[PDB]
Amino acid sequence: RLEYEIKTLEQVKESTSRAQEMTQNSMKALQDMVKLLEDFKVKVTQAASD
Amino acid sequence: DLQNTGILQDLENYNKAWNDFASNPNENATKIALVKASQTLTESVNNTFA
Amino acid sequence: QLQYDKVNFYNEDGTIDNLTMEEYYRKLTGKIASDGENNNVVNSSNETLYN
Amino acid sequence: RSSILADLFDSQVVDGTTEDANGNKVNTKVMLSMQDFGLSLNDAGTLSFD
Amino acid sequence: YYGDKNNINVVTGAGTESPYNIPGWDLFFKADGDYKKQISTNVSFTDNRW
C-alpha cells in the first residue's frame, strides 16, 4: 500500500517545487511590472507640467 | 520485491515521466524519456507473460 | 487524475470491480504470497508428520 | 511607495508656457508635488534638488 | 490577445487543479466592477455677448 502512497507523494514535492519556481519569477516580475506601472505614471505625471 | 519494488517504481517513473512531459509539453526529449518508460513497462509485461 | 483514480475490473466470473491497478496487482500478488504461507505451513504440518 | 508617489505627484500642472513668445496661456493649475518648483527625480527613483 | 483564453491549469489536490498564470485578455480586456460610467461634452463655454 505504501509504495503507491509514497511514490505518488514523491512527485508532488518535485512538481510543487518547480511550480514554485516559476511563481517567484512571476511574483517578483509582477512587482517589477507594478514598479514599471509607477514609472509610466511618473513620466505622464512629468508631462503634467502642462 | 528486488524487481517487484523496482518495477513498480519503474512503472512509477513511467507515470512520472508523464508529469515531466506535462511540465514540459513541448520537448520531444521528455517524450523520448517518457516513451521508453512506456514500452519498458510493456517489455516487462511481455516478459512475464512468456 | 487517473493516478488517483480506480478503474472497474471485468473479471470473467462476470464481476466488474473498481480498483487501482496497484491494489489489483497487490491483491493479485498478495494472493500469491499468501499461497506460499498456506502452502509452506501446510508442509510445515507435513514434515512434522514426516518425522 | 507607489501610493507615496501619488501622495507627491512630481509635477504641479499650472498651464501657461509655450515656445518662446508664442501661444501660451495662464492658470488652470492643480496641486501635486515640488518637481516644477526646482526638485528633480532621476529615473533610478531618487531625488536631486535645485 | 492570441494566447489561450484560460489560466495555466495543473493538477494539485485530491483530484483538483491549480491555476498559475493569466491569459492576457483578462488584464487587457476584462473589467472592474469598482467603476462606473461617465460622459462629457467636448466644448467648454463662456458668455458671448462679449
Side-chain angles (χ1 to χ4, degrees):
Chain A
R1 292 181 281 219
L2 294 174
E3 282 74 349
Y4 173 87
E5 192 168 2
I6 190 73
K7 71 203 190 200
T8 66
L9 265 167
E10 296 299 329
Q11 290 79 79
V12 180
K13 279 85 70 174
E14 189 277 331
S15 62
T16 45
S17 45
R18 53 169 163 232
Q20 292 155 261
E21 199 291 326
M22 61 79 71
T23 52
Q24 188 273 356
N25 300 325
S26 310
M27 293 183 286
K28 182 41 177 267
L30 289 158
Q31 310 335 304
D32 313 330
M33 276 80 81
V34 172
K35 177 66 174 67
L36 274 295
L37 269 55
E38 306 141 23
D39 306 329
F40 292 89
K41 182 58 169 210
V42 185
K43 274 76 177 175
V44 54
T45 305
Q46 183 178 2
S49 56
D50 57 358
Chain B
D1 284 354
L2 283 57
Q3 191 168 354
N4 247 208
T5 67
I7 194 171
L8 54 85
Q9 288 305 155
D10 291 343
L11 179 42
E12 164 281 325
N13 70 39
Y14 151 132
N15 309 142
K16 189 165 180 31
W18 292 99
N19 171 16
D20 291 331
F21 187 46
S23 306
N24 184 7
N26 299 111
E27 187 55 23
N28 203 353
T30 314
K31 310 181 210 213
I32 285 151
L34 168 54
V35 184
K36 180 67 174 66
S38 76
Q39 63 266 16
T40 301
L41 185 68
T42 68
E43 294 142 37
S44 61
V45 175
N46 298 146
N47 302 171
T48 78
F49 194 109
Chain C
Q1 179 47 46
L2 183 63
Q3 158 266 308
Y4 311 111
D5 303 335
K6 287 170 153 292
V7 63
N8 190 358
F9 284 98
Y10 290 69
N11 318 289
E12 292 302 327
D13 63 329
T15 61
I16 299 170
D17 54 313
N18 188 241
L19 280 68
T20 60
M21 295 296 173
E22 176 61 24
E23 190 277 331
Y24 183 77
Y25 181 76
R26 287 175 57 272
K27 99 199 172 180
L28 187 153
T29 55
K31 164 65 166 58
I32 296 156
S34 54
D35 303 339
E37 291 152 64
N38 296 114
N39 188 358
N40 310 331
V41 164
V42 167
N43 224 317
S44 196
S45 64
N46 207 15
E47 79 269 14
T48 312
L49 182 63
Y50 181 75
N51 297 115
Chain D
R1 304 181 70 191
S2 301
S3 65
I4 280 162
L5 189 151
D7 292 329
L8 63 85
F9 273 137
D10 300 331
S11 188
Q12 292 96 318
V13 54
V14 63
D15 81 2
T17 302
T18 301
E19 269 80 359
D20 294 351
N22 61 87
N24 206 12
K25 160 70 167 53
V26 287
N27 56 48
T28 46
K29 57 163 288 302
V30 192
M31 53 245 298
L32 310 193
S33 145
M34 70 304 112
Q35 182 181 224
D36 307 354
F37 296 167
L39 278 79
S40 59
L41 175 138
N42 57 41
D43 294 331
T46 47
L47 287 166
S48 181
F49 183 28
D50 183 327
Chain E
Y1 181 62
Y2 303 89
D4 186 74
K5 298 294 156 292
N6 188 359
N7 278 359
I8 297 169
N9 290 318
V10 66
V11 181
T12 291
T16 94
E17 192 113 82
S18 58
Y20 57 120
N21 138 276
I22 294 87
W25 66 294
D26 317 311
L27 161 59
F28 271 58
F29 299 119
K30 284 181 176 177
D32 291 331
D34 291 297
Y35 297 86
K36 50 187 66 199
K37 177 60 65 188
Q38 77 87 25
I39 54 182
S40 190
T41 69
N42 57 4
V43 293
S44 302
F45 58 96
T46 79
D47 191 337
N48 62 7
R49 295 169 280 181
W50 55 274

